[PDB]
Amino acid sequence: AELERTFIAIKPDGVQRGLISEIISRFERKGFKLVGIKVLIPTKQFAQQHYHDLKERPFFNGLCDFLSSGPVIAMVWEGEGVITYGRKLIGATDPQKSAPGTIRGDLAVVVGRNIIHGSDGPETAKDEIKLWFKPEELVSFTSNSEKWIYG
Amino acid sequence: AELERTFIAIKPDGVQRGLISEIISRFERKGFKLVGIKVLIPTKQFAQQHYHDLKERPFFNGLCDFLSSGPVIAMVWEGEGVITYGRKLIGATDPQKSAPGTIRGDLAVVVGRNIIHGSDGPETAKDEIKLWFKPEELVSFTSNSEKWIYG
Amino acid sequence: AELERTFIAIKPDGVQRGLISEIISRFERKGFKLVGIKVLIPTKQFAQQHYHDLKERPFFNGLCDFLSSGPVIAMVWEGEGVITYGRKLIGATDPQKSAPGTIRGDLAVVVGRNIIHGSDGPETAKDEIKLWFKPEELVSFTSNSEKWIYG
Amino acid sequence: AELERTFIAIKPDGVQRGLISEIISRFERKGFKLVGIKVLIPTKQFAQQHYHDLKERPFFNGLCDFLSSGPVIAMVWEGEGVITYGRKLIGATDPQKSAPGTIRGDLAVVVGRNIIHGSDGPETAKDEIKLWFKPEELVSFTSNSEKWIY
Amino acid sequence: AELERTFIAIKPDGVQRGLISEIISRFERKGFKLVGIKVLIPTKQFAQQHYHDLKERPFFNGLCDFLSSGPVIAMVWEGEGVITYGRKLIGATDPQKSAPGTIRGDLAVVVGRNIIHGSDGPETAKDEIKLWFKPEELVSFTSNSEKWIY
Amino acid sequence: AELERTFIAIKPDGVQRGLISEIISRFERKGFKLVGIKVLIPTKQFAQQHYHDLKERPFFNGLCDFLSSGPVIAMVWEGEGVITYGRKLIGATDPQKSAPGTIRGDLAVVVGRNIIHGSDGPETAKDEIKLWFKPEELVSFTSNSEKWIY
C-alpha cells in the first residue's frame, strides 16, 4: 500500500515558468518520496505514445506538439494513496476551477497551459511509469522519515 | 479574454499587518499581471464613493471611516478570468467561512477586518478601476511569460 | 468572543518530522495568538488521561503508546472562533481526505500519523487546556495587531 | 531619523521575471514602510534624466533603452537607515559578486540584468524620489508596528 | 559534542511582530532540536537577574523594563556548535550592521528593538538555561534525523 | 559564456532530510537552468571514481561508503558563472563556517554531513558531468527567461 507509485510530469509551460522547486515541494513536504526523476524533451512521437488514449480527438495534435515544445520534468513518486492524492494536489483539469492551495489553482490560469500532469488511476500510473522510465532509473530505499510517516 | 482586469485593494488592516508582499504574491505567482498599483489614504469622501452601493446601510459609515483610517494598496490585475479567480483567491466575505489556502482564510479572523477587497463582477470591476485609477497610471505590456501562460 | 482558546498539539510524528515552525506559522499568520506553549514527553499514563474518552476502543492503547513515543509541542491559541478554525486549519482526521492547504492535507499521508491534534469543541478545549497547562504557564497580553485584527 | 526615505525600483527584467512579491517582502518584513509605489513604463527620455550622472559613460544609452524596454515598479521606502540597508539588501552591483541572502545574489545572474535599483545616498535619494513621485503620490502614516520597531 | 545547548529568546518586540514561526524555522531547519520552550511575561525583577552582567551600564534599567513589557518566547536549542551558530544566525547586535540572511538583518531595524536574544558563550548559556527553565521543562530524545545530521 | 555548466549533487543525508525542493529552489530562482537531473544510489565503487582525487586521504573510504548509503539527486546546472556561484550558494565545506544564506549554513550542521556537493572548478565540472550523465540525459533549450536574465 505504501509502495504505490504515480507519474508526475511538469510540462513545458511549468518548466519554462520556473515551477520545478515549487511543484516538487508540494510532494516532498507531504511525505511522499521521489523514486525517479529526469529532464528531457519529448519527441512528437513519444508524446503521441503518452497520449495514445486521445489519438482521435481534435486537440490530440496540439497536446503532442506542446508536450514536445520544450523541456519536461518527469517524476515517479512513491507513497500510500499517492496516485489519488497526487491528483488532489494537482487540482482540477482547468485551473479556473481548481481551489487555491492546489498546484493548478495557485500556479496556472487556463486549461491549455495547466503546467503539470499526474496519473489518473492505478493502471495508467503503471503504464505511464513503464513508458517514461527504464527500471534502472527508478530507485528503492527506505526514507528515514518512514517510521514517522506510516508507523 | 486574457485582457480582463479586476480591482484588488489591500485595506488598512491588511497594510497595517504587513500583508502586502504576501497578498501580491498570490496574484503574481498565479500568472496574472500587475497593470496598476499605488498607495494612498482614501478620504472619507472617496470611501463613500467606492461604497456608494451601500450608502443606506447601517455599516456604511463604519466601512467609510475604516477604509480611510489608514493607508491602502490599490491594484489592477490583468488576466483571463482574473475577476472571478481574484475572488476565489480572496475567499469568503467572512474569514471564518473561508477555506485554508485563500487569502482571508489564511490571513484574517473576522468579517470586520477581512484585509482585502476584490471586484465582484465585470461591471463593478470596470467602475472600480475607473474610480481608483487615472488611465495614465495603468500600463500595457506583454509579459515574457505570456507565451507559456496562455498559448 | 475574541478570548476563546483552543488546545493544539504537534504529536511526535509532527515533531520528529520537523513541522514545528510550519505548523506554528499557520496559526500565527492567521492572527491568532500564542498564549501558552511547552515541549514534553507524555507518559503513557498522561496519554490515557488525554484520551480518557477512548479508553475502551481497540486503538486506545496504540494512541497512548504513540503519544508517548517521543516529544510533543503543546500549545494554547487565543482568538475569535479559534477552536473551530483550528480544526478547519488542521483538516480532516484522515490526511487522505483533507484538502490541500490544510495542515494534514499538506503535511501528512495516513490517519495513523496525522501529525497534529486540535480541540474539537468549546468544552473539550477547556478540559484539554486544563489538563496540559498549569494556569501559571498561560499568558495574557494584548497583541499590538489586535486593533487591526478585530476592531 | 526614522523618517529617512530611499528610492527603490524593480527594473523591467525584475518585473518580467515576476519578482515583485519576493523583492517587496525583503523590505516589508524588515520593518521599513511602503510610502510610495506605482507601475510605469519609463520613456526613453525619462530614463536619461534618471541615469543622468552617467550620461558621460559608454553604456548610458544602453542603460536608458533598457530602463524603458518594459514596466517598472517604482517605490519609496521609509525607515531608519533605509537608504543604506536598502543597498545591503540589494547586494553588489554585480550579482556574481553579491552574497547569498541579497536580492541580486539570489535572483539575478549578470550585471546587465541586475533586476533592481536603489538610491545610493541621501542626496541621490532625495532627487530620485522627487524625480519619480509627485508629492501627492507619497503617504504619511505611522505604522501600527512602529512602537515595536523603534 | 552534539549535546551542546544554548538559550534563545524572542523578545517582546519579536513576539509582538509575529516572528515566532519565522525565527523558530531558522533554527529547526538547520538541524538543531527544540528541547525546551515556554511563553512568559518576565517580571521587572526577573529581567534584572538575566541582564545582571549589565547592571553597571546606563541602559540596564531600560533593558529590564522592556524585557518585561510583553510576552517572551524562551527556548533551549541543542546541537553541535549551536551556541556559536545560534549567534551567527542571529547576526550583529545592531540590525543595521547585520548581514541579509541573519534574523536581525532580515527582521529588525534598530539596536533598541533587535527582536531576539541568544546566549553568547558556553557559560552564559549554562546559566541562562538554568535561569529560565526548570530541569523538568527540558526534554531528552534523539531526533529521527540525528543519524543523517551527524 | 552563459553555457557554462556545473555538477550539483544532493548527498544521501540531504535527500534523506527532504531538502530536495529547498536546494533546487536556491538554483532555479537565481536564473540558472536545470539541464540534467536523475536520482540514483551510487555503488560503493562508483563513489570511488567520483572522490578519486581523494583516494590518498584517510577519509576517502569513509566518504565513498556514505555517498552510497542512500539515494542521491544528481544534477547539472547551466548559466554564466554557475560553477563559481554554485559554490557560493553552497557555502563553506564546513557548515559551522558557512554564512546564513548559504545552503550548508542554513540546512546542515557538521562537515561529515554537509548535505550537498558542487563542482569546484571548470575541469572537475567537465569530468564530474561526464562521470554522472550520459550525453542523452542532458537537454538543450533556451529558457523563456533567457532574454531577461542575460
Coordinates of N, CA, C and O in Angstrom, one line a residue, chain B residues 21 25 28, chain D residues 18-27 29 103 106-107, chain F residues 29:
Chain B
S21 N 3.4 42.1 0.5 CA 4.1 41.1 -0.3 C 3.4 39.8 -0.4 O 3.2 39.2 -1.4
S25 N 1.9 38.3 -3.8 CA 2.4 37.0 -4.4 C 1.4 36.0 -4.8 O 1.6 35.3 -5.8
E28 N 0.6 37.4 -8.3 CA 1.8 37.3 -9.2 C 2.1 35.9 -9.6 O 2.2 35.5 -10.7
Chain D
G18 N 8.7 38.2 -12.7 CA 7.8 38.0 -11.6 C 8.4 38.0 -10.2 O 8.1 37.2 -9.4
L19 N 9.3 39.0 -9.9 CA 10.0 39.1 -8.6 C 9.4 40.2 -7.7 O 10.0 40.6 -6.7
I20 N 8.2 40.7 -8.1 CA 7.6 41.8 -7.4 C 7.3 41.4 -5.9 O 7.8 42.1 -5.0
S21 N 6.6 40.3 -5.7 CA 6.3 39.9 -4.3 C 7.6 39.7 -3.6 O 7.8 40.3 -2.5
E22 N 8.5 38.8 -4.1 CA 9.7 38.5 -3.5 C 10.5 39.7 -3.0 O 11.0 39.8 -1.9
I23 N 10.8 40.6 -3.9 CA 11.5 41.8 -3.6 C 10.8 42.6 -2.5 O 11.4 42.9 -1.5
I24 N 9.6 43.0 -2.7 CA 8.9 43.7 -1.7 C 8.9 43.1 -0.4 O 9.0 43.8 0.6
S25 N 8.9 41.8 -0.3 CA 8.9 41.1 1.0 C 10.2 41.4 1.8 O 10.2 41.6 3.0
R26 N 11.3 41.4 1.1 CA 12.6 41.6 1.7 C 12.5 42.9 2.5 O 13.1 43.0 3.6
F27 N 11.9 43.9 1.9 CA 11.7 45.2 2.5 C 10.6 45.3 3.6 O 10.9 45.7 4.7
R29 N 9.1 42.9 5.4 CA 9.4 42.1 6.6 C 10.5 42.6 7.5 O 10.6 42.2 8.6
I103 N 19.2 40.4 -2.6 CA 18.3 40.3 -3.7 C 18.9 39.9 -5.0 O 18.5 39.0 -5.7
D106 N 20.6 36.4 -4.9 CA 19.6 35.3 -5.0 C 18.8 35.2 -6.3 O 18.6 34.1 -6.8
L107 N 18.4 36.3 -6.9 CA 17.6 36.4 -8.0 C 18.1 36.8 -9.4 O 17.4 36.9 -10.4
Chain F
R29 N 15.5 29.7 -8.8 CA 15.2 31.1 -8.6 C 16.3 32.1 -9.0 O 16.0 33.3 -9.2

